[PDB]
Each structure stands twice: as structure tokens, then as C-alpha cells.
Amino acid sequence: MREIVHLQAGQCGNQIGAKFWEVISDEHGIDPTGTYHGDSDLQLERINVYYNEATGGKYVPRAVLVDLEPGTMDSVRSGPFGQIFRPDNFVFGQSGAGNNWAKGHYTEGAELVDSVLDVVRKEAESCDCLQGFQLTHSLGGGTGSGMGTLLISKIREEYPDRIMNTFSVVPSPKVSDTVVEPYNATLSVHQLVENTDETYCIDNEALYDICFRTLKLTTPTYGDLNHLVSATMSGVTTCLRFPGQLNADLRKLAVNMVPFPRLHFFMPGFAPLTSRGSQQYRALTVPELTQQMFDAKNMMAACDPRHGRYLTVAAVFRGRMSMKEVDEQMLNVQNKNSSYFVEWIPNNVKTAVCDIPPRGLKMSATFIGNSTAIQELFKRISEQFTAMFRRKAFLHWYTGEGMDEMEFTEAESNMNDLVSEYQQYQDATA
Template sequence: MREIVHLQAGQGGNQIRAKFWEVISDEHGINSTGTYYGDSDLQLERINVYYNKARGGNYVPRAVLVDLEPSTMDSVLSSPFGQIFQPDNFMFGQSGAGNNWAKGHYMECTKLVNAVLDVVQKEAESCDCLQGFQLTHSLGGWHGVWDGKIRKEFPDHIMNTFSVVLSPKVSDTVVEPYNATLSVHQLVENMDEIYCIDNEALYDICFCTLKLTTPTYKDLNHLVSATTSGVTTCLCFPGQLNTSLHKLAINMVPFPHLHFFMPGFTPLTSRGSQQYWALTVPELTQQMLDTKNMMATCNPHQNYYLTVAAVFRGRVSMKVDKQMLSMQSKNSSDFVEWIPNNLKTAMCNIPPHGLKMAATFIGSSMHISEQFKAMFWRKAFLHWYTGKGMNEMEFTEGESNMNDLVSEYQQYQDTTAEEGEFKERAKEEMA
């Protein structure tokens, strides 16, 4: 079995992932105590990807829950599926980082790092065939201590994240750009696949598409859980065309540092309204590229894709590949011309709860660089960080790496298929 060990870190990561476990437990036929109540062998065929089977026969998420203060863990425990987790896998400190990346990275996280790594190691060793790790977190509040250490311990396994990135219009604190820039540096160096989600896009969906007047975090988490469930569905359920973390990396990452993805989902529904939606495959593919369905803010007039993957759920015809190629042909200006076969599909027989069919979009888009440009640099609060163990050169390096990442995306956006010099350079980088 190709198991995955999941980490959920910080308040944002734990709140988002708590809803995710609620959704996929329902899809697997698992109740809030870990007891199977389903009626299909398909629900159990790959359940070991995300769950351990306890001695009593109950299923327990293979999850490590981390935060620097206990209140987040209390919130998870009081959630509908809070009792399904392994109690020993709750790892928390007694004082938070106060929105200060340096304090979290150099002070508070170091008190937890060995204990967290021990739990991760234990979960990994219990796997028959570990395929990789997934992390859910907020970019402004993740301190990056464990990323490199897990990579060092498991260099041959895929590291994947669902990252809530900084949005200029929806920001909790003035120092988020600092935190996000320092976190991106960790993600570039230590992660293989990063799914970027931002609250601005989620609010736009709630207001403009779903027509919600006062969306709550529960509404946002509903959208995120639908998307993350869609991304992972072909990892934990059978289908005609399937995938893995490794296959996704091969198909989606043409160049090592360009591993930031924009996810999307269709049909978009508010909580409790899924049963009223039914789309055909042509409608799903048509809506898939609509930027209104993206979980990361993007400009529809400046959006070019390096690679794209589509995950279909439900009773979808095997002719879906032809439909996707037709969609790509009609929208050829949205795809770079110099990467052949840059559109992949996967299919899962089991639809999301309440829907007959759905599609999840994964795009490696040039526009993701705009997310990084938005993480503007200011030094007004620099002393908050240097006073907690950081060197000013770390800021300079973080800013430089962010600029390099933006420049690299821009370089490939400006490239055409006729540039032979680029082709030779690309071959050298891929070698």
C-alpha cells in the first residue's frame, strides 16, 4: 500500500485539515469514532493510504497535528471528528510565536522539533510502502523548522504541501509579508509539490459565485476541503486512470523550482447545496479553466500554464481525454507551446458526497509569480525578527530567493518554442 503521512501545522493548517478529514472519512464510510459503516469494498480498497487500522478494527488518520499553543488542539478535539485522531500525535507548545516567524523558527519550534520528528518517524516506519508526506499550513504562520529535517531523513520521498498564501487584500497582520517570504524560501528548497490557496480567491468565490453575503471560515474551509479531497482522490480511491504523488511530480514539474500549483474545483457549491448541481463532462471541462473557479487569485488575461492535470470523479466516460484535448485546443493561448503533452487526466469512480460528477483542476501557472510579487518587502519591523535570533542577511537571502523565483517564472513565460537556445538550456536543467 502506498501510504502518506500527513502533518497539519498552525491554527490555519489544523482548521482546514480538520474539515478535510471529516470529508474523506465520510467518503470512506468512516464515522467520527473511526468505525466503518460503509457499503462498498471500494471504500476500503485503498483506505490505508491515509488511515491506520487500530487493534480494535477502527480506522485512525495517519496525521500529526502541530501548533505552538494548546488552544488550537482544543479546537480540533471539539470538532465533529476530533476524537478520531491518535491522541499521542497531538504536538503543541505552551506559547505561540505571536505572528513572528523568527520567534517560531528559532525559539518555540525548537522545543517541539525532536518530539514531532519522533512521531513522524514512528508513523513512517509503520508504513509498508511510504510514498511521501503532506503538510497543510498557512504561509504566514508556518516556521519551516521540520521541512528540511524531514527531507534529510526521507530524501527519496515526495514532500507535498497545501499552503494558504499571503493575500494583500485579506491579511491578518502587517508582518505577514515577512513570514510568507521566509516560508517560501523553505518551500522552494524542501518541497516537491505546493498547492497554493489564498483567502482572497475564496472570499471572491463566496461573494461572487455562491452569492453568500456573510461567508464564514466554515464556508472557506468547505471550498478548500472539496479541492484538497479532489486533488487526493486518485491517491486513495480506485479509478480507470490513476496517479500518485510521484507521478504528479513527474507530470507537473518541468523545472525543479517551479513546483507551485493553482488548484480549482467545479462545480462550486455552498455548504449543503451539492445535491442541486449536475454538470456534464463538457460543462466540467469548460468551467475548469475559468479563473472564477480557482482557489488562488489570478488575472485571466495573464495566465499561462506550463502543465495542467485534471482529476474527474464519478461516472465519467473514458473519452474524457478527448474532451480535455479539445478544451486545450480551444484555449491554446493559455498554454505554453514548448512543453509537449502538458495536459494529464486522472479518473476516480467515486463522486464527492452529494454530486454525480466533479472535476478538480491543478495548474502550474505563470501567474503564481504574481502571488510572490504581492509579498512586498518592508523593513519597518525588522527589529522584531533580529531580536528573536535572526540575522538580517537571512532577510536579504529570502528576498533574493523570492525575486529569483519570480524571474524564473517570467523567463519561461517569455520563451517561445522557436528559441533553440532555451531548449538546450532546458535539457541541461532537466538532466
């Protein structure tokens, strides 16, 4: 069967993974101890996708949890679903990265890179037909950006044919969490822009907005944001886990979504998102879901899609569906928003439908869009990068870890090319 191995690096990656496996395990009816207590036989039909079956019906997820400091991973052990992961997969270091890409990529993480590969290889061999790898991390952090890219380069060299998805949290436009994010992001993107096949850019600012207005949640915590990220993460892999009328695995999404190899940065979305107050007043039908997913107010990226054009779009539905409604609504969006798609691609929507809905919902959809508006995100990071690097604001920390200043300009130049390439295709033949 098709199989995936999950990698989570850093505080952001590990905490997202913890919520992600809570959602995945709940759908397949897995007890926190690892036992199976589901009701439908269709859950075990593809449980091999994520879980290795151990003796006694104890299903063990094949996830590799990496963090240069024990702190974050220690809480995962004591969490509600801590006792499901294999103890040996917790590859934790001691000296945590100081939020600098250099330390997590060259000095400290380089010592732990070999240990992680040992765990991953065992998982890859445990599979019968491995499809691809998944990485959850943040581009603004040290370990995630550093260790994540170091892992990506190494595994790519060892699994060139397979796929690797990257659910990466991206720095927010207005409010930042770390001072030196521009250096980490620019360097990290320089690695992802050539080593990963698809990326799912997410930013906390957009997720905060969704909770504030789209969900009317007064006190949102990371226990809430990570659920939306997990929900989108589960949607992308639903076809692998469950049957449907029109399926789409990870490879199918990548081929349709990526026109050119370097333009593989996407922006996800989810529907339906309704507050309990407004739940009663809204009808749950395909037409309603289509409007929300294409609404700029629901995108999980700060960049407003209306400021640019769509190269490719993918909507993965779940639950009982009507194919005619799906096609009609996609036809409406294609025509109504005439100028939001590049003409040189006659049709931009790749659809997929799964029979099983998520959790208690009777219907859901996950949105993926390869908009050119994301060029704005890279534009801002480069502007911030040049603002600091112009006079070496924080460069002595990176140079002291073995990095050379020539690398920063190479990353800057490579990043500038990506924006130029994006701008080129925003033009039209006529």
C-alpha cells in the same frame, strides 16, 4: 499499500485538517468514534492510505497535529470528530508564536521540533510503503510558516526520496490578516522553494469570491472555505484511495506538473460548484465541468491565469465518466485557448479519472495548474517586503530571536531569482 502521513501546523493548518478529516472519514464511512459503518466494500480496499487500523475496527488517522499553543488544538478535541485522532499525536507547546517566522523557526519551535519527529517516525514505520508527507499551514502566520518550514527541512533531510506536498494558504492581494505577512512569506518561500516538491497555493480572497458569486452563500465562515480546500485536497489523492480507468498518484502528478525543480508552485481548482438556486438550471456533464475548471473565476488563487501562460495542467476527474468526452473537452481547451499554454511543451494536460465520485455528487473534477501567472503573487510579496525592509519596519522582532539581517537579503535575493526564472520561460522559442 501506498500510504501518506498528514501534518498540520498552526491555526490555519489545524482547522483545515479538521475539516479535511471530516470529509475523508465521511467518504470511507467512518463513524466519529472511529468505527466503520460504510456500505460499499471498496472503502476499506485502500483505507490503509490514511488510517491505521486499531483493535475492534477502530481506524485511527495517522495525522500529526502541531501547534505551539494549546488553544487551536484544544477546540479540535471538543469538535465533532475530535475523538478519532490518537491523543499522543497532539504535540502542543505552551508559548505560541507571536506571528513572527523567527520564533516559530529558531527559538520556540526549535525546542518542539524533536518531539514532533518522534511521532512522525512512528507513523512512517507503521507504513509498509510510505509515499510522501502532507503539510497544511499558512505562509502568513508565525507557527505555520516557521514550524512548517523547520519540519520540512528536517524531514526532507530524513526522507529525501519520498514526496512532500504543501497545501499552503498564501497572503491575499487586497486584504491581509497580519501586518508582518511579507516577512514571514518571503522567508517561508525561501525554504519551500528548495525543500518541497509540489505546493498548492490558496488564498482566502479567491475563496471568498467563489462563495460570493459562484455559490451564492450569504454568510461564509471558515467552516465553508475549509470545505472547498478539503475537497481539492481529497481530489488529489483519490486515485490512491479508489480505482479508476486512468490513475494518477502523487508522484505521477508531480512528474507531469513540474517542468523545472524550482517552478513547483501550483494553483488549485474544483468543480462543480453550484448554488442550490442554480443547481436545478444546470446540467451535470463533462463539457460543463471543463469550462468551469479552466474559468479564471473559479481558481483558488488571486492571480488571474489569463495574465500569464500555463506550463502544465492536471485535471483529476471522479465518478462515472466517459473517456471520449474527457479527451474531446481537453482537446477543445487546448485549441480554443491557444495562447494560454507555452508552445515549447507540445501538450500540457495530464488527465486522471476515478470511478468513485465525492460525497453525494455523481461527478466531480479537481484542477491543478502550473501557470506562470503565479509570478505576480511573488512579485507583490517582494514589493511589500522591500517596502518594509528598506527601513527595517519590524526587523527588531526578528533580529531579537537570533536571526541576522543577512538572512533577509538572502531570502529577498532568492525570491527575486524565482520571479526572473518564471519570466524567462514565459518567452517562446519563436
